[model samples]
Target chain A: ELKMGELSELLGYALKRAQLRVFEDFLHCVAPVQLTPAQFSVLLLLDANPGRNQTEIATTLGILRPNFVAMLDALEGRGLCVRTRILMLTDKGRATLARAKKLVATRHEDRLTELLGRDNRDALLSMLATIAREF
Target chain B: ELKMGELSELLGYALKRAQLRVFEDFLHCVAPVQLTPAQFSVLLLLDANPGRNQTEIATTLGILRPNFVAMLDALEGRGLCVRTRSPHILMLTDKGRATLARAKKLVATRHEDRLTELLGRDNRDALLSMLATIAREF
Candidate 1:
């Protein structure tokens, strides 16, 4: 019990566990288009930054090029996106993007709201920032 | 800026960023003994649960077997622990336990204290518990 107690008391353990919960829900919510959270975010960025290249988008999102390119491949394969010098979302991409946004709004937000409570969400985020301490 | 704003507003991104911060600090603190945070936790578990098998320990800590075996191999290679059959478990070598002791006192507590101080001692556990609750409740 003491060993379990010590492990449970660890902030790292708690944070990872919490993150996994959100990660799973994120996967579920985005499964409609088979877009991962990273993919969904990439599409969002493409919509927001129409002329951005892979390197620029990857750098902005802190993603490595290999994984980013693979993600772009998946999106492009689905005819949702295209890339030459810069990336652009196809009309289908925009439609999927819209659906993704609505799904996140309804499923993601609603679940998190139930889980975190509206009042506590901002406070929890602020606490995380405090823990991060400029890093 | 809009792309940055979009990423900045994501809960997953924020979570990962914060995880990275604490992770780096944890690495710095544990580097003297060449232990990653996961390795350190494994050592702590072995010390506390002397006879626990690898599978049991891994299951308890939510680590996958492949990664767990690799970690065990590293620890054994470093002479920090040993494994035995009859269900196949682990126990820390004296050197390992000694290192764990020094780490908990010298390195681990210092950073834990510094980070915990930001939120106050009593509230620190409460905050973690709050974070953990989301997983269970969700």
Candidate 2:
């Protein structure tokens, strides 16, 4: 093992490394549905807030409008969502998202819970949410 | 604000967002010294582990060898570090050491201090410990 020294204690370093691990597990868990995290977020947002325009949805997700267009194109090509003046997920999209959520909960999140334990996992989530919103 | 729904409950989502936020603050705090987090990491590693080659350092940091070369070029071009050709050992320049000292102060005071204020010192320590565990074991 490499000597991490202060690198092990750096908050940003730990945050980044943990995030990569989480995202890697997310991809593995959701591989059957073939949805990237960005794509899944888009679907989740569309389901939760219907009739929102591309710019509105993209901006909320911190995706650039131009990049959002290309991502939408991919989803549209796959018959997952349609872009009218507003965006909406198709039945296929909703089904895929449903499957993805199940896999995430059962496999992805279960792995995290096993690693961190329930209470610690919840605490970690709360701290991360605070940083995301308030930091 | 848009309704986040299940996004609010997502561990990966929160992790990515929090990482971006922390990195953003790190850049802002260290902007005066002109070091990115990646560059700062390189400097810190070089200072801590002398006589290590580029490959050893890069591998430890999860940086690809090819990309590490380009990053080293940028740092060396700016008089930060140099590679000795005998076995391609890497070492920080005097300027690199001085810059890293300033960078460390900025990170501790402006960057990490702000985090301590936001999360409280105990919570900040807990958060760091938990994140480190996830990084190491998960």
Chain B TM-score for all candidates, comma-separated: 0.87, 0.93
**Residue by residue across B1-138, what tens digits does model 2's lDDT show?**
199988888788999889988888899999999999889999999988888988889888878888999999999999999888753888899999999999999998898878889999888899999998887888
Cα error, residue B6 of model 2, in Å, equals: 1.6
Point out where model 2 deviates above 4 Å: none
CA lDDT of each prediction against the hidden true structure: 0.76, 0.89
Candidate 2: tens digits of C-alpha lDDT, residues A1-135: 166667787889989888887888889889999998999999999998988788888888878878989999999999999978578899999999999989988998888888987999899999999998899
Error of 2 at A86 (Å): 2.4
Lowest-sum lDDT 10-residue window in model 2 chain B: B82-91
List the candidate 1 regions with Cα displacement exceeding 4 Å.
Answer: A65-70, A130-133, B1-10, B119-126
- For model 2, the local distance difference test gives 0.89
* Local accuracy of candidate 1 as per-residue lDDT tens digits, B9-126: 5566566566767777878877777777778888988898888888888887678989999999999999999998773868899999898887776444766777777778766766
